[PDB]
């Protein structure tokens, strides 16, 4: 929907930009912001949850050529490395593809919440905005943002500007 | 006048906690144990031919 | 009795994919892991009902 995203939004991570009679203005939705954060936070905490301890291991550098045992000590440690390396590449990749879809869904979800709220008093413009079909002054706007907009109130006004 | 129809899912009085990517604990309707944690303390003589070096 | 997995600690059933009894095993056995419990979810998120 939103082709783009807003620079200069520093109140939070997701927000509302309105335009009415009283003028334009902006404001962030803190709840769906923290919702994204809390997930990234916890995901991140699980990744860096403190690793293993290891003490006396095998030797991994060698001065002289010993043949068979040394070939094996080097093969064991290389095999280890290659695997752990794969684990880390895959981890990050998965975690990231998720962290993206997580945050794209958060925006997405806020939009729907807002659409179900307006019920039949507004239409989706196509770029992730709403054309609200009534006089929605600044009190009314925050009433939407903070989850209290009663549609049953502006129904008649809106419904009629929409249809004839 | 009109009518109301609601879509819903179940839930249960005592769930079980499990882990996910994002979440350390999260209650779900049911889960299952994947790690065999205890033993019978004795060795079964089948189907493997056991021989006791006494 | 019948048991396709043997350990020093005794015989264990291999109905699970992992085990925590002993790293020494013989036969068709679950893979030894350091974890003593891993719960796999077999149902949806459990949500109690709102109120009123």
């Amino acid at each position: 929907f939103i082709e783009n995203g807003w620079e200069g939004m520093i109140d939070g991570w997701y927000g509302f930009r309105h335009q009415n009679s009283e003028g334009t203005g902006q404001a962030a939705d803190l709840k769906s912001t923290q919702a994204a954060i809390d997930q990234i936070n916890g995901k991140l905490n699980r990744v860096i949850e403190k690793t293993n301890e290891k003490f006396h291991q095998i030797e991994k550098e060698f001065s002289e050529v010993e043949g068979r045992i040394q070939d094996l000590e080097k093969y064991v440690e290389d095999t280890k490395i290659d695997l752990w390396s794969y684990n880390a590449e895959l981890l990050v990749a998965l975690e990231n593809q998720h962290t993206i879809d997580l945050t794209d869904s958060e925006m997405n979800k806020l939009f729907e919440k807002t659409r179900r709220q307006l019920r039949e008093n507004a239409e989706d413009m196509g770029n992730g905005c709403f054309k609200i079909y009534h006089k929605c002054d600044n009190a009314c706007i925050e009433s939407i943002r903070n989850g209290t907009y009663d549609h049953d109130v502006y129904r008649d006004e809106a419904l009629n500007n929409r249809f004839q | 006048s009109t009518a109301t129809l609601c879509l819903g899912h179940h839930a249960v009085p005592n769930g079980t906690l499990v882990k996910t990517i994002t979440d350390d604990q999260i209650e779900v309707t049911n889960a299952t144990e994947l790690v065999q944690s205890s033993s019978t303390g004795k060795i079964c003589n089948n189907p493997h031919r056991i021989l006791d070096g006494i | 009795c019948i048991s396709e997995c043997i350990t020093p600690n005794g015989s264990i059933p291999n109905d699970k994919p992992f085990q925590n009894v002993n790293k020494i095993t013989y036969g068709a056995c679950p893979k030894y892991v350091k974890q003593n419990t891993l719960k796999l979810a077999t149902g949806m998120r459990n949500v109690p009902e709102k109120q009123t």
Partner: antibody
Amino acid sequence: QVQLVQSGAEVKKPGASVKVSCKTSGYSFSTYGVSWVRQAPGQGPEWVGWISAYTGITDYAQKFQGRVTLTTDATTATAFLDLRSLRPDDTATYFCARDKVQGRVEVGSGGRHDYWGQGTLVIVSS
Amino acid sequence: VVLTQSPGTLALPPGERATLSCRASHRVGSTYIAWYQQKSGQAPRRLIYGASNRATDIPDRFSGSGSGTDFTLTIRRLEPEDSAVYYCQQFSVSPWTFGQGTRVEIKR
């Protein structure tokens, strides 16, 4: 510096309810939630609930749900705790404490119950 | 998520080592554990966060550790200052829960 001054001991009778204040200072009120823990004399602490001063979100312990209401006043920088239908069970000392970090980057868990109220006694007797 | 911690009380002389355990009924991130000390009257004072780290202004006698289900707090060389109750707490899973409480009496 950073502190949490709670209200003085109240005394209430089996039916009634109660409200306890927790005044904060020395840190920006809105980037951190508040946790509430109570303590029946001689027993150990049990958790009551948590409220975010950033998002207004709450999580009550399911033991109390219904009876308990957490709120915050950003102007005075104070968290409040309202408990209704007081049983004599609820006779305890009630603590508030800073908890979770909100808005800000993230982690790990550096508090998470950094600093605590001096405690505030509630007696439910007839 | 139940934290049963042991031993009940324990009495040890000054300059000895108390070793407190905290077994949890379910597995828990090492990051969502905390330990507290409480001398009766005053409010709980927080020793350790994330299972491993000291909060500030805390002597290094105090230290913590644990993996998944067994968390432990070690006071490395006791003082008479340390006679108190100690609580482990987890806040991974609502309801955030506390331990039974291990008492420490110094045995003079």
